[PDB]
């Protein structure tokens, strides 16, 4: 999300960008750590819903 | 059984072409003599 | 709607015959995918045969495919639909190869593609 | 019940892959032992093709055997096949290949008269509905000499008369261990071609009782020679594409069990996780 | 109490039998299944067909199942039992078709049955 209000930023001043987000399968593990540390009920695989 | 029976009297109860073109003529190998003596 | 009261006997019949072509030919898959074609029974082959020819003629190129391939879409008529796939499981194109039944539409897109392939309906 | 069947299916296709190798090895070994009887039959094949054709230079070329029969009606061709079925496609290029030679006899006014040899032809034959004049079966894999000689005294006595006007053969001709071809030969009439002199002021031949009697006699153990070779040529080409189908087939079951065992795991883990879920939701909705 | 000290070493020896003899059915199954069984040995072919009349012969019309297949129910003592299967491992009866051992008693209903449809034994 950083990089992706980086990337925006030149984005909406008429510059083109090229973003690579190296993996979002290890994204995707955190934000399932900070949910299960939340207590959040998980789902498929014991991802959250979001 | 026999109503059955009588019944079955009156009952009314080829090579597929393959489609397969022919064989070349020069692929039908002959077996020959091999005469060593010129007479054509 | 697939019931001979709404669709007709012969759409439903020939549907019918095709979903059991193709539910045998996928009963026979597992055999066929360790040891192949050969060793099935000269019934069962003529009905996988008959069966991949039907699962590649249900394919079609459709009006949304252009954007993808560059090749048009087709259309074609229910009646000729129920034609055609009556051929097919009746075995009047078992000669023709497996491809030349891909992205097509009718039957005259199937013989153009099979003269193309050198075949004949 | 997913995961019982998962793991029944490995097992069966480890069995089938363990079968599938064992028969790859075997066919190697009897590949060797088909080379071996190929290699062993040529010389004689060798000694009464040059002993007839030194008797052909001074012979009366009139044997009905050798001469092209005006009309023809009928033709016979031999069809050599397999028994066992753990080949790949052996059997289906014999039947194209016999197919084309069909159609190219129908392309002649000749009706085929149809003599099969295995068993596999005879299923691919009777569901065709074709009438098969003979059959021989048993020896596709081991034949003797005496085999090849019953199968060509029926084919030149069905010649020589209901009769046919020649003789064809579709077999494996086996060549190089890595390609084996369906083959259509003609084994009758023989065609007599006069190739050269080779021989001018040569020491005469003496024949006893005469040339012509000695070539009519050595004819039909020619043709009989000649199909003794081709069936030990199909033996071996036989045994190559066994090895070469189980092979393959070793290959394909060992990728299911790749698959499977794939499979496995993943939905070994995916009941291990909603296990767990089911436990804590419960210990949750206690909390 | 399947201990050679409690039911005798002839009821044991036959019961081992039995077990392994199913246990290689149950191994050649999806060899069977797969490849035919024609690919078999003839030991395994042999042991098959033993194992399809073992397998059936362990089957019985009870006595509380008359109700759902109309046939009466049978008895049959442990020695009969024991000598009925060890002459069906031994093969005294490879000859009598598959029926004739589905659902009967003892030797004699398998007498019965396999001349039922043309056999003895």
């Known amino acids: 999300y950083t990089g992706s209000a980086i990337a925006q930023h030149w984005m909406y001043e008429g510059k083109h960008v090229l973003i690579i987000f190296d993996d979002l399968t290890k994204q995707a593990e955190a934000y399932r750590a900070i949910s299960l540390l939340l207590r959040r009920p998980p789902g498929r695989e014991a991802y959250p819903g979001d | ?40 | 709607i697939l019931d001979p009261s709404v669709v007709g006997d012969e759409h439903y019949r020939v549907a019918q015959e095709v979903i059991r072509i193709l539910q045998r030919y996928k009963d026979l898959q597992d055999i066929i995918a360790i040891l192949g074609i050969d060793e099935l029974s000269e019934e069962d082959k003529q009905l996988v045969n008959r069966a991949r020819r039907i699962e590649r003629f249900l394919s079609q190129n459709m009006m949304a495919a252009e954007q993808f391939t560059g090749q048009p879409g087709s259309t074609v008529p229910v009646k000729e639909t129920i034609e055609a796939f009556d051929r097919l499981c009746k075995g009047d194109f078992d000669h023709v190869p497996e491809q030349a039944f891909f992205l097509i539409g009718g039957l005259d897109d199937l013989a153009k593609k099979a003269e193309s392939l050198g075949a004949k309906l | 019940a997913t995961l019982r069947e998962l793991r029944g299916r490995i097992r069966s296709a480890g069995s089938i892959k363990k079968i599938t190798k064992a028969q790859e090895l075997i066919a190697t070994s009897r590949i060797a032992r088909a080379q071996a009887r190929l290699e062993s039959a040529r010389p004689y094949a060798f000694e009464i093709t040059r002993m007839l054709t030194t008797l052909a230079a001074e012979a009366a070329l009139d044997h009905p055997l050798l001469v092209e029969r005006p009309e023809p009606k009928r033709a016979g061709v031999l069809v050599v096949s397999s028994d066992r079925g753990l080949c790949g496609a052996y059997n289906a290029n014999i039947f194209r290949r016999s197919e084309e030679l069909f159609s190219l006899l129908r392309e002649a006014g000749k009706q085929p008269v149809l003599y099969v040899v295995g068993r596999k032809a005879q299923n691919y034959y009777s569901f065709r509905n074709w009438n098969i004049t003979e059959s021989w079966m048993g020896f596709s894999e081991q034949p003797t000499y005496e085999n090849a000689a019953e199968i060509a005294s029926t084919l030149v006595d069905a010649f020589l008369l209901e009769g046919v006007d020649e003789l064809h053969i579709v077999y494996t001709e086996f060549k190089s261990m890595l390609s084996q071809s369906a083959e259509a030969h003609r084994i009758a009439p023989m065609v007599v071609e006069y190739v050269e002199e080779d021989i001018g002021p040569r020491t005469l031949y003496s024949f006893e009782p005469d040339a012509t009697m000695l070539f009519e006699s050595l004819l039909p153990r020619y043709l009989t020679t000649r199909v003794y070779a081709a069936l030990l040529e199909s033996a071996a080409s036989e045994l190559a594409s066994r090895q070469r189908a189980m092979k393959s087939a070793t290959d394909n079951a060992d990728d299911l069990i790749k698959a499977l065992t794939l499979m496995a795991n993943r939905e070994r883990q995916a009941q291990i996780t909603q296990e767990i879920s089911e436990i804590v939701g419960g210990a949750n909705a206690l909390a």
């Open chain 2, 1 to 40: 059984t026999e109503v059955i029976k009588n019944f079955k009297k009156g009952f009314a109860a080829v090579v597929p072409d393959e489609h397969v073109e022919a064989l070349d003529e020069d692929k039908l190998a002959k077996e020959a003599v091999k005469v060593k003596k010129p007479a054509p």
